[PDB]
């Protein structure tokens with residue numbers, strides 16, 4: 720029922736890059752999803768205490784959210800685009816694993832994911 724530490728956003732010994740694909744992931748992909756009317760449940764780690772979801776972190780062992788992704792991107796945490804794409808996919812998958820099919824949150828994730836897929840389809844060549 721308690722919250723775990725959030726995912727890290729800093730790790731000085733993890734090697735890092737700033738690539739054109741990672742730049743697109745921030746300027747286009749994250750910015751597009753972040754501004755959406757359905758972004759709000761996804762802009763920060765799930766607070767299982769405030770939301771009264773005592774089993775959330777029993778089920779979701781690889782938490783991820785756009786607040787974390789945003790900080791990772793702003794702080795150049797990633798080596799490659801794949802790492803960041805994986806973080807978005809973990810976020811959507813978690814939502815679909817935890818929640819009931821058809822729930823509001825699922826529809827919200829689906830709307831964000833559709834946009835994510837449309838933007839990733841035009842990920843620039845390196």
Ligand SMILES: CNC(=O)C(C)(C)C
Pocket residue numbers: 760761765770772775813814817818824
């Ligand atoms: C991303 N948030 C969720 O999946 C809830 C469990 C609905 C708070």
